[PDB]
Amino acid sequence: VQSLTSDRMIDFLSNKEKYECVISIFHAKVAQKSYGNEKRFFCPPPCIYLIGQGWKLKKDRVAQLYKTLQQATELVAYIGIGSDTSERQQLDFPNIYDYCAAKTLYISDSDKRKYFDLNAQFFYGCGMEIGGFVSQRIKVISKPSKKKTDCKYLCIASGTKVALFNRLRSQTVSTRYLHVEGNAFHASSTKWGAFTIHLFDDQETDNFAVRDGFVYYGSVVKLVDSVTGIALPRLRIRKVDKQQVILDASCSEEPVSQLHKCAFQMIDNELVYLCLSHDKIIQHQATAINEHRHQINDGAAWTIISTDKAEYRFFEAMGQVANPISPCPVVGSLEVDGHGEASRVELHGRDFKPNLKVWFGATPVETTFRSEESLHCSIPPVSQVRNEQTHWMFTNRTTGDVEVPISLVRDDGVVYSSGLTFSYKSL
Amino acid sequence: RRMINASVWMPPMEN
DNA sequence: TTACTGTGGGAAAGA
DNA sequence: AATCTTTCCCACAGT
């Protein structure tokens, strides 16, 4: 019947890293539109990481059921921009199972939507569909801003993520992306880092304090790789024009905006900048023009843009399923009410279906489908959620509270970890 | 005002 | 060497 | 008025 069992749920929750399949879609938060016949490619290229040993297990099941029912267990993917006049494009192809990037996506001006997202659809080479997964939303822009209003898309808040790229003399082929690989920064033509950009608070350290707020030119900034947590030293972000760094006592009035060109100066030496030489990241010393301006080269000039991420996790706990794994439910929040036997929870999120049941740890609970953004259930009593088998997993050893992860489970056995934990110290 | 911990990678000097 | 095209600056037109 | 955004244009420097 393929219904999830408690024993199987317990094995999964204790061992997520060898079962759970992760699909992470990364992309910029804005795209410049194309007029006429032109194609202005999305940069950095939207990409997809398939993460987890679960992917290899999934291939194994597809391999072992290929011979009951060789390279028809190979991944095939497509991506498009949700438009019925836009071509779907074929995607390229540690715990990284596989990686693909879409390098030639664009949106024409004939497409009148203010926002769009990308739908990546995955298949096995034999025709078997895995499913369609959407990105976060992307705002269409006409061109980079030259202001001296919606800040959520145009400005860069401390704590958010950005991609940084180098391009020489308007040449697509020359594009290189700041990226960390092997515990060092470098520049790649296929991969790009999403870096957290922080306003430094106040000779340097591994531990530093940060500030909220928008990043302005002339701001001291810490860039931190979101994947490895490695950082660059403190850098002051500077506006650039045409191989010159503009140091004017007036650009500090200007907030850094999407698709602006900038330079990063070392805090110790005002003449030294972060610079790219043949995919190698270096310190390069500028030549002083005057007090308002420094001479650099196109190697020290970076375009900055805000990036986003859509992540989905699933496990086919009761064996390979006949239907697509998608639509993958997403849980944005839990809203709990009442105390004791009165206590209930509303799940808020997106892409719910009536074929889902909420599990508090390894305990399934009767679930009301209200809409695709609302599920409702009762909170099961502590005594039935934590027992002599599960005590070790659901007990906070510092405070003694009972904490259980919330999963959404489909009736054919696909478990979707929500990312959320229910604590009985609520209530 | 948060604290962050991140080991630093130093860009090698040019020559 | 010659045909063709992402990309960035600038002009023009609109808000 | 003045400034910004949107759309149109075209050359550069590559493939």
Side-chain angles (χ1 to χ4, degrees), chain A residues 201 206 208 210 212 231 283-284, chain B residues 1-2 4 6-7 9 11 14:
Chain A
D201 203 89
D206 275 16
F208 60 94
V210 298
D212 287 326
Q283 290 192 46
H284 170 72
Chain B
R1 199 80 31 85
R2 287 145 199 87
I4 273 89
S7 60
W9 180 85
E14 184 138 33

Side-chain angles (χ1 to χ4, degrees), chain A residues 172-204:
Chain A
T172 196
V173 72
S174 75
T175 318
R176 297 306 181 266
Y177 300 93
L178 187 69
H179 177 244
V180 356
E181 186 198 305
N183 281 108
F185 285 74
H186 84 318
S188 161
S189 56
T190 54
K191 291 191 191 184
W192 51 275
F195 300 91
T196 311
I197 183 168
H198 300 278
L199 259 353
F200 182 75
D201 203 89
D202 264 67
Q203 283 196 11
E204 223 197 313

